[PDB]
Structures are given as structure tokens and as C-alpha cells.
Swiss-Prot record:
Residues 9-68 form the Tudor domain. It comes from the Eukaryota. This is PHD finger protein 20-like protein 1. Interacts with methylated DNMT1 (DNMT1K142me1). Interacts with SOX2. The lineage of its organism: Eukaryota, Metazoa, Chordata, Craniata, Vertebrata. Is a negative regulator of proteasomal degradation of a set of methylated proteins, including DNMT1 and SOX2. Involved in the maintainance of embryonic stem cells pluripotency, through the regulation of SOX2 levels.
Length: 68
């Protein structure tokens, strides 16, 4: 699959964005891996240890552009 066109987000390893974490708080986050077969990404929530890294489908509303 090809990643969707979401303005302000680059679907690339190492790209930063904002993601809603396990406490429902928005904070900067970083893409760790992309699974193009299932259309999901491994997201690192920067306010959290990598034990909290989570696979998120790339259409999820838990992702939004990084605050400018």
C-alpha cells in the first residue's frame, strides 16, 4: 500500500509528528518503522520510554502534524 496524503506529516522513518499517548495526551512522536503491507507504523511517544512504542494504522486520528 501507499501511505495516505495527510498534510504536515511525512510517512518516513525518523519523521516527527504528534501522537496521542496511552494517557490520551498529545505530544511529539517519531516514526520507528513502517509496515506498508498492513498500512501501519511503529510510533515512539517521545514523552515515554520505548516500552510504550505502539503500532498505529497510518489513517489513525491518534496522529496529527507536529505543532508549529
Amino acid at each position: 500500500h501507499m501511505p495516505p496524503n495527510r498534510p504536515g506529516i511525512t510517512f518516513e522513518i525518523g519523521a516527527r509528528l504528534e501522537a496521542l499517548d496511552w494517557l490520551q495526551k498529545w505530544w511529539p512522536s517519531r516514526i520507528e518503522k513502517i509496515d506498508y503491507e498492513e498500512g501501519k507504523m511503529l510510533v515512539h511517544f517521545e514523552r515515554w520510554s520505548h516500552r510504550y512504542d505502539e503500532w498505529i494504522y497510518w489513517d489513525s486520528n491518534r496522529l496529527r502534524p507536529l505543532e508549529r
